[PDB]
Amino acid sequence: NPRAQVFEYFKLKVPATRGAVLKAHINHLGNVAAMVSFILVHHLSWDPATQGVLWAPATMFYARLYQLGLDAVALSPDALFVARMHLLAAIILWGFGHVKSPAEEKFLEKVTMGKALVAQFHFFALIATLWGLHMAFYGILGPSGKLEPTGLSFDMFGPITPATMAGNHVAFGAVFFLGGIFHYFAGFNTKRFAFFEKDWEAVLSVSCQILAFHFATVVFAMIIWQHPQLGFGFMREYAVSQYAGPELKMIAQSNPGLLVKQAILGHLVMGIMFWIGGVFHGAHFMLRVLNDPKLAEEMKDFKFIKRCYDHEFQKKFLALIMFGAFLPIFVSYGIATHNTIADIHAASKTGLFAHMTYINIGTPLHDAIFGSKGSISEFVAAHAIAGGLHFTMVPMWRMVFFSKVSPWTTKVGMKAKRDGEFPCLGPAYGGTCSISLVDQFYLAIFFSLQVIAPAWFYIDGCWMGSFVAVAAPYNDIYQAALATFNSHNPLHQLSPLTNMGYFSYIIQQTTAMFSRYDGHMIQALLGAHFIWAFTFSMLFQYRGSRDEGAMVLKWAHQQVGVGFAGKMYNRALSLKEGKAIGCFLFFKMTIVCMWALAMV
Amino acid sequence: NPRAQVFEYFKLKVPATRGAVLKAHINHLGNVAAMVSFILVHHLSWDPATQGVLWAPATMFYARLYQLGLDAVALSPDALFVARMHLLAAIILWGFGHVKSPAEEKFLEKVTMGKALVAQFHFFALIATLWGLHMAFYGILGPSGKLEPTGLSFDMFGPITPATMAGNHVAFGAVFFLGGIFHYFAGFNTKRFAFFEKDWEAVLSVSCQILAFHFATVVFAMIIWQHPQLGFGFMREYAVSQYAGPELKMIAQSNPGLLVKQAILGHLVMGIMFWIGGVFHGAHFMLRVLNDPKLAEEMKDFKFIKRCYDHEFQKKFLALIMFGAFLPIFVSYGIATHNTIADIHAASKTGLFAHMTYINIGTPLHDAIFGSKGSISEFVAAHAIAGGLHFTMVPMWRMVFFSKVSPWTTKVGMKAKRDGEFPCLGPAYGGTCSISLVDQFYLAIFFSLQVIAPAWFYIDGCWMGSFVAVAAPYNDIYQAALATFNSHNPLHQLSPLTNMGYFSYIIQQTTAMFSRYDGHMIQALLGAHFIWAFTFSMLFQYRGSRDEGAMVLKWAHQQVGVGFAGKMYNRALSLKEGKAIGCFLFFKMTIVCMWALAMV
């Protein structure tokens, strides 16, 4: 009964029946096919016959055409045939998705989520097998620049060839075939798993969380597995192939990993989004358990019912998370700040900042386990990212364990937080904004920038030993780091290691933005900065001011006879609306700015 | 009874008696003398014998020594004698300021503010006359680089000479002497003025507001009156004189107005601060009138008692202010955005942004009245500043007229806002934060950045026709503007007109910061940016989150035996504290960044 299990604003908008959910899934497949058809045809460039495919997302999808062994010229007959067939598919899916199918519904009443998962195992088995067979007999782009059937081999431990990569797919087909049969007969009834059949939000949460972990493995694989046809190196090769437009080629020659790093940034960002949103759903499911006095006799066996009321567990556990953030942040940002002060003042002959030593630490544990040879850049960057992860987890674990009662609600005499969405409780006790579950969701989104930004600066080849460029007295440290980066870090395939800390790198990249794409990424930066600034007006403690001022603007529009425009100021966005929209736009406008950096 | 007339937090801190107020004034004079003594001796440079005076504020005070005809070498015998005598004065003033003087108090019970103003007229008369006489007989720096007595002349309409500038001071002495005598006998009892004797906050408000207007006249005079000894040109001359250290000289040769523009930025910023704080005091005085049912029988004659309750006056008046902001902002930012898009995309040969026309409008009204010959840079900059002023006035006029009742309090069924300092009323009606008088004070401080920033970018020679540098197709417009700027704009004495809009100018100035003062202004930028970011944690709708999380941090410190440090998290800053501190630091850290721009 989903309409009873969502926040108020969504009760009238959430698919409310088995059938409606299936229709939403169908229409979502229509969206997928439709995006493919749109982006092969539109948003390529101003003049594709001469400029090729220059614009983002289209470049990545044309890089796929290239990897498939098709003519990846802008608007080629292959590209158009692919785009038009996906449009056909989209229209058929949306068609079915917007008509009611009572027989389909009647059957869905008999389907369990365990059964659906069996079916998904064997659908995935089909896809994996058929794609292995397509590779095997019809081929993909081969080393000779021609479409080449891969053959089929199952020598898992021999060298990677097209044939064994085909075998890898067929093997996954077999594995999911046997696994689907096994679970068809045995079910998922084991304890600690039977409860999933009870609640769609629990299943949904787990899907999001595991998908987030898949995203992270994909980020790392896109850096490490750079084979030009069987890995993500097809994005390097496409950008300098015969199909690449002149400007894309010029950019890729000084930035070989250009398109790979755009894909990486997309998967980093989406992965963070599914991690935090998935945890929000699991926490919301738990909170509904805790608010349904009925929903307790089946879940009493789980420890979280107790932990969500135990103030000593809450403090010990959250304190451990905060320590896990504090220590690596202190080490990484403290070192990089000392080194920054040293780089800044290196020309000084006297005074407080003259003749500072550079802090230079390697990464012996990572090197011993994975075969890198890291420098202070990796040491600082990895501790800043690790710290950002634990930092982000502070609001995440509060969603999970603080959203019904906390030491604070007990301290101030409350029985329990009323629900998961209330924005505040007013000025009592010096102010109470954003103790609810959803407000900690937003805060985790905000904090997640401490993961995304250092990760991006690292991946794009910033010097992460310092916030500014390495000064001349410390050049030896940079040069040694550059040698072992080139010889031992797979990232050197995508990015040269510059001597520029992020602040200096911003100057250089932004300067380069004036002269690529006719300057457009400067327009992107400026517009994104404006919108980001405006979110302050929605996120600051100033909503009442705006609601009061909005009455003057509405009144003024009515006086002159344009009340249809004054309706824009019928009221200010509410606390809840302004926090949701402000967080969304604050977060995404930051990502737009980083996307500019990914375009040059 | 000031303790009854201030916000709660200040009742125990405000000087509570006539005598205590006088002592505070004495101690403030001690602060003035002490700053002079400190800054002539410390914070000059790391090694003054070789580097001279390099650091801000000290440079401006040494430029004064220079203008006085004294040896303005760092730590010269003249500088030390001046510094040590001002220290003596500070110690004597603070000495007297921290002892009780009962006879002085008994006499103060007999002093009125009208009497004090008579006395101030004749003290100012003394200062003006004695300084004219010092100039006349002992002199200031003369055109020959020597101290030269000016003589004394009263030829007001002849050419400006040192002698007539001395006469100007003596004449001001005479005028304030006659004016003090006149008011000694006639008083200030005229209607609409008698009420000032009633309330110290009304007098205080007016002093701040008029001082703000003086600040603005000083900003303009520092640009326009650039005479090298009798005007603010002494700051240009000092920076390239024999006393100037080598680096100050190197900077001034490419930036002649360096020190003048530092003084300008100081007076712009302080003037805005006194304007808004002065209006806050006047509004607070009015609000106390409206809250004292007694305080009405003497003020009923004033129209503001009515206006503060009249919802049609409130909407008409505030709507007029908003229009006065909307129209010039729309014109200035809309034009500059079109021109920005044109400059950005000027290299494009096709597509939506190719071959745009530059919007080019002059300033014929300003030219006809003041003798300028302005370009699109002046047209846009002046409308952006004018618009920023009306924008800032929106929260200012709400302080004055919305702080007891408003159309909003009537709409939601309230009798009246309880006081001037409450932070919010909670989530009712979609949220109620920052409708009080003090919260509109903060908002005016925030909004005032729309005055300060464009004014600074203009004064420092940014191209204000565009947010980026002028592109080659529009170079003719820049060159024509440069010719008439050089020949008709007095600002060219302080700043060359660059072809750089503020975004491009930021790149160039920040690049220059790496190589002046051993890079220190990069440290200033980075530290200021960090603090600015942190204010979000105090200004966002998130105070309850922090108070709840603070309990975990305090608990963790206590567990390990360092509860004296955990007291830092005894509680989060309250709504009221965090808004005051957040606004102060948001505002000042922005000013620090602009100060970096003023240093190069």
Partner: peptide, 25 residues
């Protein structure tokens, strides 16, 4: 990509985005 084409399409983006706040307010 003439001036009239380009102004027209800019105004199209403007009118379109302007309706986003109406959905909430």
């Amino acid at each position: 990509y003439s001036p009239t084409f380009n102004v027209a399409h800019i105004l199209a983006f403007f009118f379109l985005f302007l309706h986003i706040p109406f959905y909430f307010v």
